Design a binder for these strands. Structure first.
Lengths: 121, 106, 14, 80, 89, 100, 82, 107, 94
DNA sequence: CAGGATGTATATATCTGACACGTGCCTGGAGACTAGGGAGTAATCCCCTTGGCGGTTAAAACGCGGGGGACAGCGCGTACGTG
DNA sequence: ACGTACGCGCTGTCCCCCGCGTTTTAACCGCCAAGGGGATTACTCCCTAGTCTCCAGGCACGTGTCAGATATATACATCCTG
């Protein structure tokens, strides 16, 4: 027989043991708001990706290329305004691929195709 | 003899001299002809004298006298003859032209 | 199968 | 900073694609988009760092990212 | 800094409209890119033809490759005016 | 009765797919191509003469552009779950690339 | 003067390509449609090709020219001329 | 003094001299260091010593001694990183890499 | 009437890595045009590098930064490890 | 069709931080003068595209069945959007 | 949490494209030529790089009205859900 294992060997769970291992009406029909959300966005230019969660995403990527980098607060923007656009283009292409496949909801099949056809794979 | 700028002598507004010095130092070629920069100054004007034109109209039709980077993104993505010149380039703070496919609309 | 490279070894051997 | 790609939220992607033009976004996108965005930055940064690492600087300044983006073909405007 | 030059144009084509301090950046970043593409193509074009010096004719031919369609017509129509006006004096 | 032993619809094409991808010669017929290029350039500047290779260089690129198109319109036709490609795909696979 | 050559690209020559591409069944409209695309692709390459030929003042479109017009658009070519 | 070719001292096969001129003639910069050519011939000589050994090992498998473009097209598209370097390139007389989508295959 | 080329060199390397194989013309004029492509990207890259940093000249380092951008993946870590091994041998032998 | 509820668009007024103009400044550009090296200009020649000739056969066009995929319809149940 | 629109799987229908003979055709090959234009030199010339000297246009900084952001509070606009 094959027996997995137990990961941790105590009944207390170390919560009670010091130096713990484990303790230190009205509704819109579907879709009608979607379109209202588009015209409210395609008319605006404000950045969509939240900034401070992006800053911490760029830093994490830079580490395994070089250590102790310091980004100018401008060069975190110039990345964001690029990677926002890259995605908005990708989503237009996937929307085209889905309108093609005759369904409305984009899906990872659509993402992967809109990348393969671009040759940017 | 009072000095007259090449840009003013040619009647243009862009700096013939500054374009000329740029053409030399960029290491494009060993020598740059006398008539090369003046021609390139004019070609630079007409490309700004058209993007600033189309964007200039965007301000009026949008009722904001100052041109903000979106008014650029509407001047170029509307015009096909320009869009192909600006195919790959992204404009920061530009947004996207507003459209929705026919199948989506109810 | 009549025309094949069979991809003997891909990773670099410097 | 163990997992920050989980920081780009579900409404973050949903907001983006809403600008893109979609209507209904299937659930598996919200994860799959992160896979694309990640492999985009790993290419843009790895170039931006190299320009930096060359000039001996220790700061990836905007004039670098604009350059790294340019070779990608995704020319960027407004910074230099 | 092509910005003073850009303003002079805008104040000509639109005597009332103003320009934000970010658009100038777009244009100063834009003109430089078009200039680089053209002058870069011009250099490669002289190299193919074994010519040593970039001249007036090299830039004109360099334009008709980049600018699409109607722009190629009026740009080279504008360029020839400048050289003839410059060569007039 | 009377059966000519016709292969199943679908297995001649796969066969000849396996025959062309293996091979490497030129597909678009040489001379009727040359009479096309001479006809296109006759529009942009009259009375040109084409060097021999310069016609070949085109056909070598014009093929490997279309083949790059079909191998990319097919992915669009597989996508709608059907096999037969159709002009509503080459209209797609050219707009995805952005080349339009 | 030359006329009506695009229909010279024979209908099989469209499938013979498409085979090498990797498609199995081809609809009826593709044939008439593909010519429309290939004609667009030549008026691009040939033009850029002609412009160089005009530039050096040489009448004959050099094989080396076409390699350049392609190199500009983004489809480099190897082996012809160099 | 006896002449020792600069391509010998580097140990390279490609010519370092001929490159060192090409950098000057192509107008890539106003001055060219003496380290650039030696370093630039190596990279070239490395890559050209990559496509070949791959092409060769493709030739032997088709039972032909000589290398022909069809072998090169097979050596480059198979490899994942060389293909990414030559992504846009189109090789003359190259043919295609055999690929059939799985949906089309009969059943 | 001389059009200088890399036909001698590519052929010399081919004997190093396949002492039996030989290369046909139409396959050579590919390699003779592949090198002239790479050497026009690498150099053309370390021409903008020097210009950006405002250094006037082009030196080897500017080529490492030029290689590690074009050559994708494992090639970048092998080329520059093959470049330095050359240039180090050169200076030490001069 | 009739009608409330909703969201965006619209008006009036209130600040500001920000772009337009002023002013001083110094650094790049304009003037002026060569020098030789690149560029244009004239035979020439030869080799190399265009052009025609005829056989010939590989291939394109054409014809017909029917076999299978394109497409339309439908039932549905769940993975979506909405709050 | 919920309620329902849609992706999808199934059935059914039919048209249209693949398969394979026939029948027509024009690509191809090889062959000859002619003259056209791209490729040498000679020559001569004139144009831009290089250099020196002087100065004013572009740049940076200062500031100061001011058009745009912002808050608030109507006027229709669509959207359902009968």
């Amino acid at each position: 027989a094959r027996t997995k294992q137990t990961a941790r060997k105590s009944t207390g769970g170390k919560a009670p043991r010091k130096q713990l291992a484990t303790k230190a009406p009205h509704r819109y029909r579907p879709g009608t708001v979607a379109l209202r959300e588009i015209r409210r966005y395609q008319k605006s230019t404000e950045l969509l990706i939240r900034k401070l969660p992006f800053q911490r995403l760029v830093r994490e990527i830079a580490q395994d290329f070089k250590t102790d980098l310091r980004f100018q607060s401008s060069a975190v923007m110039a990345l964001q305004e690029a990677s926002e656009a890259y995605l908005v283009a990708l989503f237009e292409d996937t929307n085209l691929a889905a309108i093609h496949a005759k369904r409305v909801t984009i899906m990872p099949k659509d993402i992967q195709l809109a990348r393969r056809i671009r040759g940017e794979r | 003899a009072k000095a007259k700028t090449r840009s003013s002598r040619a009647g243009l507004q862009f700096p013939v001299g500054r374009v000329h010095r740029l053409l030399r130092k960029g290491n494009y070629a060993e020598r740059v002809g006398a008539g090369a920069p003046v021609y390139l100054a004019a070609v630079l004007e007409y490309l700004t004298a058209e993007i600033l034109e189309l964007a200039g109209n965007a301000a009026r039709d949008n009722k904001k006298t100052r041109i903000i980077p979106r008014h650029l993104q509407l001047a170029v993505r509307n015009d096909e003859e320009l869009n192909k010149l600006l195919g790959r380039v992204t404009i920061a703070q530009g947004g996207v032209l507003p459209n929705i496919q026919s199948v989506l609309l109810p | 199968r009549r025309k094949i490279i069979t991809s003997e070894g891909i990773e670099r051997s410097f | 900073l163990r997992d920050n790609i989980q920081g780009i939220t579900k409404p973050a992607i949903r907001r983006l694609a809403r600008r893109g033009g979609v209507k209904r976004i299937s659930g598996l996108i919200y994860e799959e988009t992160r896979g694309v965005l990640k492999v985009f930055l790993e290419n843009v940064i790895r170039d931006a760092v190299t320009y930096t690492e060359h000039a001996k600087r220790k700061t990836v300044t905007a004039m670098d990212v604009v350059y790294a983006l340019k070779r990608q073909g995704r020319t960027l405007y407004g910074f230099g | 800094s092509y910005a003073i030059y850009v303003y002079k144009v805008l104040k000509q084509v639109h005597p009332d409209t103003g320009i934000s301090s970010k658009a100038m950046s777009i244009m100063n970043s834009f003109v430089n890119d078009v200039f680089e593409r053209i002058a870069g193509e011009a250099s490669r074009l002289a190299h193919y033809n074994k010519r040593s010096t970039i001249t007036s004719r090299e830039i004109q031919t360099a334009v008709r490759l980049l600018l699409p369609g109607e722009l190629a017509k009026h740009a080279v129509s504008e360029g020839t005016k400048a050289v003839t006006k410059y060569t007039s004096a």
